[PDB]
Curated annotation (Swiss-Prot), chain B:
One of its GO terms (biological process) is translation. Component of the ribosome, a large ribonucleoprotein complex responsible for the synthesis of proteins in the cell. The small ribosomal subunit (SSU) binds messenger RNAs (mRNAs) and translates the encoded message by selecting cognate aminoacyl-transfer RNA (tRNA) molecules. The large subunit (LSU) contains the ribosomal catalytic site termed the peptidyl transferase center (PTC), which catalyzes the formation of peptide bonds, thereby polymerizing the amino acids delivered by tRNAs into a polypeptide chain. Keywords: Acetylation, Cytoplasm, Deafness, Disease variant, Dwarfism, Endoplasmic reticulum, Hydroxylation, Isopeptide bond, Nucleus, Ribonucleoprotein, Ribosomal protein, Ubl conjugation. This is Small ribosomal subunit protein uS12. Component of the 40S small ribosomal subunit. Part of the small subunit (SSU) processome, composed of more than 70 proteins and the RNA chaperone small nucleolar RNA (snoRNA) U3. GO terms for cellular component: cytoplasm; cytosol; cytosolic ribosome; cytosolic small ribosomal subunit; endoplasmic reticulum; membrane; nucleolus; nucleoplasm. The keyword Nucleus applies.
Swiss-Prot record, chain C:
The modification N6-acetyllysine is found at residues 65, 115, 154. Component of the small ribosomal subunit. The ribosome is a large ribonucleoprotein complex responsible for the synthesis of proteins in the cell. Part of the small subunit (SSU) processome, first precursor of the small eukaryotic ribosomal subunit. During the assembly of the SSU processome in the nucleolus, many ribosome biogenesis factors, an RNA chaperone and ribosomal proteins associate with the nascent pre-rRNA and work in concert to generate RNA folding, modifications, rearrangements and cleavage as well as targeted degradation of pre-ribosomal RNA by the RNA exosome. Residues 107-181 form the S4 RNA-binding domain. Disulfide bonds: none annotated. This is Small ribosomal subunit protein uS4. PROSITE patterns: RIBOSOMAL_S4, S4. The keyword tRNA processing does not apply. Component of the small ribosomal subunit. Identified in a IGF2BP1-dependent mRNP granule complex containing untranslated mRNAs. Part of the small subunit (SSU) processome, composed of more than 70 proteins and the RNA chaperone small nucleolar RNA (snoRNA) U3. Transmembrane segments: none annotated. It comes from Homo sapiens (Human).
Curated annotation (Swiss-Prot), chain D:
Keywords: Acetylation, Activator, Calmodulin-binding, Cytoplasm, Developmental protein, Differentiation, DNA-binding, Methylation, Nucleus, Phosphoprotein, Transcription, Transcription regulation. The chain holds residues 26 to 148 of 148 of the full protein. This is Endothelial differentiation-related factor 1. It comes from Homo sapiens (Human). Interacts with TBP and the transcription factor IID (TFIID) complex, NR5A2, NR1H3 and PPARG. Interaction with TBP is regulated by phosphorylation. Binds NR5A1, ATF1, FOS and JUN via their conserved basic region. Binding to calmodulin is regulated by calcium and phosphorylation of the IQ motif. The keyword ATP-binding does not apply. One of its GO terms (molecular function) is calmodulin binding. Phosphorylated (by PKA and PKC). The lineage of its organism: Eukaryota, Metazoa, Chordata, Craniata, Vertebrata. The IQ motif, which is involved in calmodulin binding, overlaps with the binding domain for nuclear receptors and transcription factors. Its phosphorylation probably allows a switch between the two activities of the protein. Residues 14-90 are annotated as: Interaction with NR5A2, PPARG and NR1H3. Residues 69-88 bind DNA.
UniProtKB/Swiss-Prot annotation, chain E:
Residues 100-118 have a biased composition (Basic residues). It comes from Homo sapiens (Human). Its main location: cytoplasm. Mature tissues, such as adult brain, skeletal muscle, heart, and kidney, express low levels, whereas tissues and organs with significant populations of proliferating cells, such as fetal brain, placenta, bone marrow, and various glandular organs, contain significantly higher levels. This is Small ribosomal subunit protein eS24. One of its GO terms (biological process) is translation. InterPro entries: eRP_eS24_sf, Ribosomal_eS24, Ribosomal_eS24_CS, Ribosomal_uL23/eL15/eS24_sf. Residues 91-131 are annotated as: Disordered.
RNA sequence: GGUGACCACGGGUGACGGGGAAUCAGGGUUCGAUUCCGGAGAGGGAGCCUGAGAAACGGCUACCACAUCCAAGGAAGGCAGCAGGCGCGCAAAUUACCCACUCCCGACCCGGGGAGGUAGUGACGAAAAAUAACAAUACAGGACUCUUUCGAGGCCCUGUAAUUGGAAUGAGUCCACUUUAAAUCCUUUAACGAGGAUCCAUUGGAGGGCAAGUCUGGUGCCAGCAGCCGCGGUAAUUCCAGCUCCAA
């Protein structure tokens, strides 16, 4: 037989465990969309 | 060309419905023998019992040993192979457990480099699979 | 058997072509400078526009002098102007084809609460709507999607219960007031 | 900026939107130079490089944190040889790279100051 | 009571049920939906009647307080109304005594009656020992 | 003698039919077991009394198949009704309350109605709609910019962005009022109830189509990913993770 059932979790077992870094509570919903528009869409006052 | 008389509905409808029999989708949809040969019996999913874990080998451009399982169904319990669609789920499954196998996605045909396997295993013993994989819920011990 | 209805229709339809940058940017403009929550509302107002355009279109192809044509055109124009989207003098079945979605969004109450000057920072305006602070002529309404009419524009005001019209200051007002009053005599 | 306050004040009419260079994209990298002046510029052919006290401060920060260059590179999400060169002294300094290794180290190398005992204040004020 | 006013509309007459039916609206700007008992006396006093022949129900206030709609029911006499009034309202304000067993025990008893044949004694006895 | 290529007859139907549903240039294509109407049936045939009205089955008889109690002498069965069980399956709700609404039935204002209504379960699905608003505050670099570098903002692009900084509130406990047959819920409406307002939004992706990383570290045709082109053997834009963005 192949014997590859031994290596079923090879990379997942090997890969070191790094803690998920902490982030602040992301503004969601309408505020998130506000942030999107602010970050992408600058509107300039016409002359 | 094609007949375009006035009182010629019989000819046109007979011709069309006759030639309706000449495409794969309608043929496998209305003959019914495909559904009889369909191992799911037309079901989207069906429960299955694990019979043997078997590895398979991919096509030419790729090179891997793909993990699969031979599964017997409960209703019309024939035997077919299923794909454990993730890295470490194969060690998560024991022998002789209920599974909820499903279609692959391209309608009863093998996908990618996989030879002859059309089915993915989900919902191992009633706890979920990918939640088992991420560990959101554990094995029932 | 049961005395229920099971009557309901979706107010919105999804765009058929996903992941198209130009429409994404356009709808993002609309949501940003109109302060909506999600593109579901944008699609819902677009769907309303599509329905009215279909109605106007199936009117236009219908021969004039038809009493149904005159009747339903009159009703449609009258309801649209009563909302306030279309000018009164603009009185023919065609300009509604030329009409677009932005003036529909203008009828959303979240924007007149801005335009009359009482609510700056339209997001602040919407949260004030959800605050149950604004009151239609005699009723307090908390729906940022309210579509106002001509006979309602001049009768939008703060609720007496709101700590901006009548009395009853908010709960944090009481909190700070009694905290300050507790430290001395 | 007050111009945005005017845009809010210009509630009745007016206002158009104009985007930016990226507008939502991930570059994970940013060339410090304008690259349009670099096209236009022809007389100057010298790059300022990084000075050695920069690398010495980096070394002191790593020692104080007790991090090999490998670990710091893992922290910054750049190649280890990048911080290696930043220590050695060639490094063709990049402001984003410097800001990243800056945030990693407690000692502030960024700006006209060589080392701030704590960058931007403890817990940043 | 300081700022609470009662208004009425759809006012109509009928000695058909020797009664007058009109829908009412109450203003309670800075207070909850007012209880029925005192506004009953209010309707009694502004129609110069006793606050007992007055019956009223179905108060649903609007959004944000203020106006509450309900159907007032005035009558000519306690007994005339007693002849023609649904029992539940007569039990709300205690005037008709409502006390019977739940439908389950009653159905079981009925099945016991249909079990015993004919004779009154066993039938009337089919609730003594089956108590 | 009847019918028949103008398709009889026969077979299949995973067909109860229609009103209607989905889709939507038009034409069309699929679905309509299912609340309205019509039909059929009440384990499977058959035969029946009564009755104006049944071949009735919450009426009877016979056979078949199940299957109950049994002093073994006999007796009694039909949830494709309301529930609620077992089985079947990927697949489907509480053995609740009430006749108050609707109407029905009866000798009858008065009784009865698992019809029906109400509640319970209910991410089938549909409508709306929270997860924050405002105000005041930083370093860095740059087309830059100005005495030529110095100084300088005339900007643009990045900061713990709070302690900003105290206003308004629901989510919740929560007095009642209301609702109701009695309730419950909703709406009012008091008392509390928010600054990581830690009262915390997730789901799938970031080579292409198809919006988003030619970041990092593991991995080394292995593991795996991948609808499909393909990716992966040491430096992987595709696996496994950290960070960052994309989409709803
Ligand atoms: Mg059938
Ligand atoms: Mg059907
Ligand atoms: Mg029927
Ligand atoms: Mg029958
Ligand atoms: Mg029969
Ligand atoms: Mg929330
Ligand atoms: Mg990745």
């Amino acid at each position: 037989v192949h014997g590859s059932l031994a290596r079923a979790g090879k990379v997942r077992g090997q890969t070191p465990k790094v803690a998920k870094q902490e982030k602040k509570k992301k503004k969601t919903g309408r505020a998130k969309r506000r942030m999107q528009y602010n970050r992408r869409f600058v509107n300039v006052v016409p002359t | 060309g094609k007949c375009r008389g006035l009182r010629t509905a019989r000819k046109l409808r007979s011709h069309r419905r006759d030639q309706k029999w000449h495409d794969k989708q309608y043929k496998k949809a209305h003959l019914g023998t495909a559904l009889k040969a369909n191992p799911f019996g037309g079901a989207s999913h069906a429960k299955g019992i694990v019979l043997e874990k078997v590895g398979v080998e991919a096509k030419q451009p790729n090179s891997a040993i793909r993990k699969c399982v031979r599964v017997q169904l409960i209703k019309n319990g024939k035997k077919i192979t299923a794909f454990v669609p993730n890295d470490g789920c194969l060690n998560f499954i024991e022998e002789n457990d209920e599974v909820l196998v499903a279609g692959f996605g391209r309608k009863g045909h093998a996908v990618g480099d996989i030879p002859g396997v059309r089915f993915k295993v989900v919902k191992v013993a009633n706890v979920s699979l990918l939640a088992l994989y991420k560990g959101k819920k554990e094995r029932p011990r | 058997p049961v005395a229920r209805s099971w009557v309901c229709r979706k107010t919105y339809v999804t765009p058929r072509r996903p992941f198209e940058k130009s429409r994404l940017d356009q709808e993002l403009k609309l949501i940003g400078e109109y302060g909506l929550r999600n593109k579901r509302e944008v699609w819902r107002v677009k769907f309303t526009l599509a329905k009215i355009r279909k109605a106007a279109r199936e009117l236009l192809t219908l021969d004039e002098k038809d009493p149904r044509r005159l009747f339903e055109g009159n009703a449609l124009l009258r309801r649209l102007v009563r909302i306030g989207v279309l000018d009164e003098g603009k009185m023919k079945l065609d300009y509604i084809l030329g009409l677009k979605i932005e003036d529909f969004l203008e009828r959303r109450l979240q924007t007149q609460v801005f335009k009359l000057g009482l609510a700056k920072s339209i997001h602040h305006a919407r949260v004030l709507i959800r605050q149950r602070h604004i009151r239609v002529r005699k009723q307090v309404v908390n729906i940022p999607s309210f579509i106002v009419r001509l006979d309602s524009q001049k009768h939008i005001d703060f609720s007496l219960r709101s700590p901006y019209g009548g009395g009853r200051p908010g709960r944090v007002k009481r909190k700070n007031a009694k905290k300050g009053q507790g430290g001395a005599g | 900026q007050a111009i945005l306050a005017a845009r809010r004040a210009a509630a009745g009419e007016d206002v158009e939107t104009s985007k930016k260079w990226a507008a939502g994209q991930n570059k994970q990298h940013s060339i410090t130079k304008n690259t349009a002046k670099l096209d236009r510029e022809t007389e100057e052919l010298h790059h300022d490089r990084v000075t050695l006290e920069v690398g010495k401060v980096i070394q002191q920060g790593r020692q104080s944190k007790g991090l090999t260059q490998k670990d710091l590179a893992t922290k910054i999400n750049e190649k280890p040889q990048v911080i290696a060169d930043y220590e050695s002294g060639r490094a063709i300094p990049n402001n984003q790279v410097l800001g990243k290794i800056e945030r990693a180290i407690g000692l502030k190398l960024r700006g006209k100051d060589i080392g701030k005992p704590i960058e931007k204040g403890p817990r940043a004020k | 009571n300081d700022t609470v006013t009662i208004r009425t509309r759809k006012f109509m007459t009928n000695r058909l049920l020797q009664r007058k039916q009109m829908v009412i609206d109450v203003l309670h700007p800075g207070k909850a939906t007012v209880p029925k008992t005192e506004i009953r006396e209010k309707l009694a006093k502004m129609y110069k009647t006793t606050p007992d022949v007055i019956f009223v129900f179905g108060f649903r206030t609007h959004f944000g307080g203020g106006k509450t709609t309900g159907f007032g029911m005035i009558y000519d006499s306690l007994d005339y109304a007693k002849k023609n009034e649904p029992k539940h309202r007569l039990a709300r304000h205690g005037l008709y005594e409502k006390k019977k067993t739940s439908r389950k025990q009653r159905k079981e008893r009925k099945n016991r009656m249909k079990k015993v044949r004919g004779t009154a004694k066993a039938n009337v006895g089919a609730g003594k020992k089956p108590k």
